[PDB]
Amino acid sequence: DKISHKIDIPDSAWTIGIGEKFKNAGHPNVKYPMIDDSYVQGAPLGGFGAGTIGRTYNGGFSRWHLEIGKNKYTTVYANQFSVFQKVEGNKDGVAQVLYAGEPENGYLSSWKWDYPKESGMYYALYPNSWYTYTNKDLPVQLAVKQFSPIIPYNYKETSYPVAVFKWTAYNPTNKNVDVSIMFTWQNMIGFFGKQVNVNSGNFNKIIKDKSKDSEIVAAVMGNISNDNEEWNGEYSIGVKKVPGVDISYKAKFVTTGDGSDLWHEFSKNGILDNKDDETPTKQDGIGSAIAVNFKLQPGQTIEVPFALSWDLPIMKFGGGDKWYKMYTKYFGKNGKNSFAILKEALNNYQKWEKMIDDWQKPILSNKSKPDWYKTALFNELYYLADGGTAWENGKVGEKRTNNMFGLLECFDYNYYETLDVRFYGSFPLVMLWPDIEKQVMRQFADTINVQDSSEFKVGSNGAMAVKKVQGMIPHDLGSSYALPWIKINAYDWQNPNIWKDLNSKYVLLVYRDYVLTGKTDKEFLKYTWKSVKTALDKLKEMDKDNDGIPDNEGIPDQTYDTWSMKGTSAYCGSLWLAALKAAQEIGKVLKDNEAYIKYNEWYKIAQQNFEKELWNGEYYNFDTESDHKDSIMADQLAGQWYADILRLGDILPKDHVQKALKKIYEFNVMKFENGKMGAVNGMRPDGIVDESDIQAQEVWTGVTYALASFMKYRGMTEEAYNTAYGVYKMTYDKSGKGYWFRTPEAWTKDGNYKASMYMRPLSIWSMEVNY
Numbered sequence: 029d030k031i032s033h034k035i036d037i038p039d040s041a042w043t044i045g046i047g048e049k050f051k052n053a054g055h056p057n058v059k060y061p062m063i064d065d066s067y068v069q070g071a072p073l074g075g076f077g078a079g080t081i082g083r084t085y086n087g088g089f090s091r092w093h094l095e096i097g098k099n100k101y102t103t104v105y106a107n108q109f110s111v112f113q114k115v116e117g118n119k120d121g122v123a124q125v126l127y128a129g130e131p132e133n134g135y136l137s138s139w140k141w142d143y144p145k146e147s148g149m150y151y152a153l154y155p156n157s158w159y160t161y162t163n164k165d166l167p168v169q170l171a172v173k174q175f176s177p178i179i180p181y182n183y184k185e186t187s188y189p190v191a192v193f194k195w196t197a198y199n200p201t202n203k204n205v206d207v208s209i210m211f212t213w214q215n216m217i218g219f220f221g222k223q224v225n226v227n228s229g230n231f232n233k234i235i236k237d238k239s240k241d242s243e244i245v246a247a248v249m250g251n252i253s254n255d256n257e258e259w260n261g262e263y264s265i266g267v268k269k270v271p272g273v274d275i276s277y278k279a280k281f282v283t284t285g286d287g288s289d290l291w292h293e294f295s296k297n298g299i300l301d302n303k304d305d306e307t308p309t310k311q312d313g314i315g316s317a318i319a320v321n322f323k324l325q326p327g328q329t330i331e332v333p334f335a336l337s338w339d340l341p342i343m344k345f346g347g348g349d350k351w352y353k354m355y356t357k358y359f360g361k362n363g364k365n366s367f368a369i370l371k372e373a374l375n376n377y378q379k380w381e382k383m384i385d386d387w388q389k390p391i392l393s394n395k396s397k398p399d400w401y402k403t404a405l406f407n408e409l410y411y412l413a414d415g416g417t418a419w420e421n422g423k424v425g426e427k428r429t430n431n432m433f434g435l436l437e438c439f440d441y442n443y444y445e446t447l448d449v450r451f452y453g454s455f456p457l458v459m460l461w462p463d464i465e466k467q468v469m470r471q472f473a474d475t476i477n478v479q480d481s482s483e484f485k486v487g488s489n490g491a492m493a494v495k496k497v498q499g500m501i502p503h504d505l506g507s508s509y510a511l512p513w514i515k516i517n518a519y520d521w522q523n524p525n526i527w528k529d530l531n532s533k534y535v536l537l538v539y540r541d542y543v544l545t546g547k548t549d550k551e552f553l554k555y556t557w558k559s560v561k562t563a564l565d566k567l568k569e570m571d572k573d574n575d576g577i578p579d580n581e582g583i584p585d586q587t588y589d590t591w592s593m594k595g596t597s598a599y600c601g602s603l604w605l606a607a608l609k610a611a612q613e614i615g616k617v618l619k620d621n622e623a624y625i626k627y628n629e630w631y632k633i634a635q636q637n638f639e640k641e642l643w644n645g646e647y648y649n650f651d652t653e654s655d656h657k658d659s660i661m662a663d664q665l666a667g668q669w670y671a672d673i674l675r676l677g678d679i680l681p682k683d684h685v686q687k688a689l690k691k692i693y694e695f696n697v698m699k700f701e702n703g704k705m706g707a708v709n710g711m712r713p714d715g716i717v718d719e720s721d722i723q724a725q726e727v728w729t730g731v732t733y734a735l736a737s738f739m740k741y742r743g744m745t746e747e748a749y750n751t752a753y754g755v756y757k758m759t760y761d762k763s764g765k766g767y768w769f770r771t772p773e774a775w776t777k778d779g780n781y782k783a784s785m786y787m788r789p790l791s792i793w794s795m796e797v798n799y
């Protein structure tokens with residue numbers, strides 16, 4: 029490996045061998061189907077709301093999230109980088125697709141597949157990833173840096189449906205070597221959203237944009253139809269000329285054939301035919317190819333940038349609504365702008381690289397933080413783009429001031445912005461894209477007094493319940509299968525209108541978002557204040573026994589939606605105390621004296637009773653009335669965690685909080701698989717995992733990272749990082765279960781998972797205490 033020194037890969041990048049097999053991998057162990065796309069994943073490409081494309085460590089473009097809200101795992105084999113090399117004065121060169129695998133059927137059988145093992149590495153530090161190619165039959169070593177411009181406090185480039193692939197080639201040998209790099213792409217119009225004749229009308233064109241000291245050559249893969257539909261638009265691939273390289277291309281090869289129409293050209297001398305052909309296809313799949321060829325002398329390095337863009341302006345959801353995607357604000361809505369997007373990337377990618385470096389540097393340059401922690405912190409952010417992210421710029425046919433946003437809970441439970449989960453999962457939004465975060469919370473504010481009296485069947489018991497109750501915060505903002513932002517509470521396993529955490533978590537989220545953006549946005553507090561008061565006032569009515577605390581009802585009426593709580597619970601009770609303290613403070617800021625006094629009185633009464641009911645001398649009991657009420661819950665003091673973040677001070681005595689956290693570390697962490705897997709949710713006082721419900725026996729990755737945040741705030745630094753380390757180990761390490769770029773909600777002690785690609789573990793950003 030002589031190429032790694034020519035490029036700048038951080039030591040904290042997650043690393044795996046190209047073609048590596050992973051032996052230990054976890055799977056769901058479940059009654060009903062659950063997504064399991066394997067451990068062959070990688071960092072995604074694409075901006076927020078753009079649709080994303082998962083290119084795996086094996087090189088394949090395989091995890092398609094281009095249909096917003098859907099996860100489709102299938103390798104489009106035509107989409108590749110390939111290399112040709114010939115040592116000067118040899119009869120023949122060699123050609124190789126840079127993919128560690130081969131097609132299932134006979135399509136593209138002419139191409140040289142099966143890139144060998146032990147011949148390169150994949151590296152990831154989101155939003156960047158890299159591949160190196162260090163192959164005994166390729167004298168010139170290659171690397172590529174690939175990324176999209178995901179940039180905190182930037183709402184423009186961060187939206188773009190674009191990726192850059194910056195190649196470096198180096199010749200460590202003492203012979204001249206002729207080298208070509210070729211990007212192939214299938215014209216994927218019709219891959220989704222088209223009900224009949226999936227390729228019909230697809231056509232490819234070549235654009236050569238020549239200007240002083242500049243040439244871009246690109247293929248634009250579109251359809252002859254000018255229909256404005258979800259399925260229609262364009263893909264583009266292209267390259268920018270640099271000194272010492274020539275460009276060649278082929279506008280049209282057949283992807284539903286043996287591929288030799290292209291490969292016989294590339295494998296001869298790495299130079300394509302430069303044949304334009306705009307003839308539309310009917311049944312056959314088609315694709316385009318862009319290549320560069322160059323001669324490298326001994327010791328010579330060259331850098332060349334390629335790019336990929338996708339202008340698919342319209343997203344359609346299952347309930348029929350069609351919306352424009354955010355990036356259309358910058359490029360237009362007509363779906364004929366892929367070249368413009370690609371050109372912007374090829375002419376600005378160096379600036380984008382620096383902008384990314386600028387926001388990663390503060391963390392990377394902090395040598396007090398271990399690299400493993402940095403690996404997790406950056407790579408967990410994959411989910412902000414990969415989570416079915418929807419970011420609208422108008423209804424098709426509809427203009428407002430704001431752009432509604434939603435991130436999915438996950439793909440198995442296809443719910444936008446699940447509030448009980450975003451309480452944990454939304455840290456990167458508030459910390460890095462706060463204008464999005466505030467927009468989402470205003471969306472929830474707007475729903476508070478919505479009433480929908482139509483009834484739905486509750487999954488857990490089969491009872492009928494009212495869809496949406498006035499004054500209760502919704503569970504979610506809908507599903508991609510139905511009508512995001514329009515039809516809320518898509519979730520039906522339980523009835524969220526009687527949840528005891530949603531209203532308090534909502535208030536806490538509001539005040540968090542004010543505090544973590546500088547305590548200056550009084551307008552945001554003013555917008556949400558009536559909803560905050562309504563939320564707490566409704567929840568107060570659920571106090572059945574006049575102790576001043578809402579009562580859990582012997583059912584799962586909160587985020588642990590199969591784990592019953594009854595009476596006063598540590599979880600909902602602490603959240604309530606913290607929410608009251610937040611509302612007092614908002615009252616003070618807005619000069620609403622009567623609210624301050626009311627919520628101060630509620631707080632003092634509830635705080636006194638919480639402590640009396642639950643403090644047992646060592647920790648806070650799970651609740652007052654359940655069968656295993658003295659279980660040690662990992663999340664027992666979630667309210668105090670948020671109070672620490674919100675600078676609301678002590679809701680419970682310092683000594684008791686410290687004792688509780690130490691108990692959780694000693695038991696839920698250290699007595700669960702030797703502390704190597706996170707914090708199990710429920711442990712009995714005798715040191716055995718609570719078996720009352722499956723959720724008690726699970727580690728929740730997002731709960732664990734939040735708990736590590738809590739410990740860090742409380743000066744339990746070693747316990748904090750040791751607690752978080754087990755989640756990192758399980759996700760990313762060779763000794764773990766292979767969950768990189770699909771971090772799940774949960775695992776059990778055997779490592780098997782629930783709900784891969786989950787929002788909650790974005791809570792790791794709550795560990796950025798100093799930030």
Ligand SMILES: [Ca+2]
Pocket residue numbers: 570571572573574575576577578579595596
């Ligand atoms: Ca009560």
